[PDB]
Amino acid sequence: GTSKLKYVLQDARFFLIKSNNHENVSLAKAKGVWSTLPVNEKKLNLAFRSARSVILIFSVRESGKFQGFARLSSESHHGGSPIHWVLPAGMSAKMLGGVFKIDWICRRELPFTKSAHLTNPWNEHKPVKIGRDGQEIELECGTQLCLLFPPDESIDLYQVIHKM
Numbered sequence: 001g002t003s004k005l006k007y008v009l010q011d012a013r014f015f016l017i018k019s020n021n022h023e024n025v026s027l028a029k030a031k032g033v034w035s036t037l038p039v040n041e042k043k044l045n046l047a048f049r050s051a052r053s054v055i056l057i058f059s060v061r062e063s064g065k066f067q068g069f070a071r072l073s074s075e076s077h078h079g080g081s082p083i084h085w086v087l088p089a090g091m092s093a094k095m096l097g098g099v100f101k102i103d104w105i106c107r108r109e110l111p112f113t114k115s116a117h118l119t120n121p122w123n124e125h126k127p128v129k130i131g132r133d134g135q136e137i138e139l140e141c142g143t144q145l146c147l148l149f150p151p152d153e154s155i156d157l158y159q160v161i162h163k164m
């Protein structure tokens with residue numbers, strides 16, 4: 001069902017995550033972590049303290065799809081075991097040092113063709129698939145985008161509701 005999902009998404013904030021490669025999203029799915037550039041790390045930390053749920057919606061460049069979405073369960077933290085991200089050119093491990101813990105809400109794909117009717121007011125009302133890494137998605141657009149994903153029956157949202 002979709003009712004617990006709607007409860008998790010109620011008054012959430014939503015951010016677009018754009019990865020150049022599939023390997024980093026697969027690591028994030030396996031380890032429940034994500035790291036981003038400092039300019040976005042600061043925005044996510046502010047958002048984490050400001051809202052019941054902060055949702056990251058992931059898309060791999062050139063894939064034509066979103067790969068899933070997840071909820072921040074912590075602010076960024078430093079000093080843990082290094083995650084072996086595949087680092088894009090011009091991006092170093094020191095730049096991705098801040099690690100957020102995330103709980104996946106959906107690990108299934110959504111092709112851009114299914115989200116063509118959704119535009120993001122915070123990016124000039126361009127289709128929601130369009131945006132730089134870290135682009136915030138307005139509440140209604142983001143909620144409808146997350147509801148478009150096929151249900152992920154492997155996930156039990158009871159545990160993430162308790163974290164709100």
Ligand SMILES: Cc1nc2cnccc2c(=O)[nH]1
Nearest residue numbers: 018019020024035036037085
């Ligand atoms: C973990 C990580 N991977 C990426 C891959 N491509 C572009 C940006 C990123 C990023 O901010 N973080």
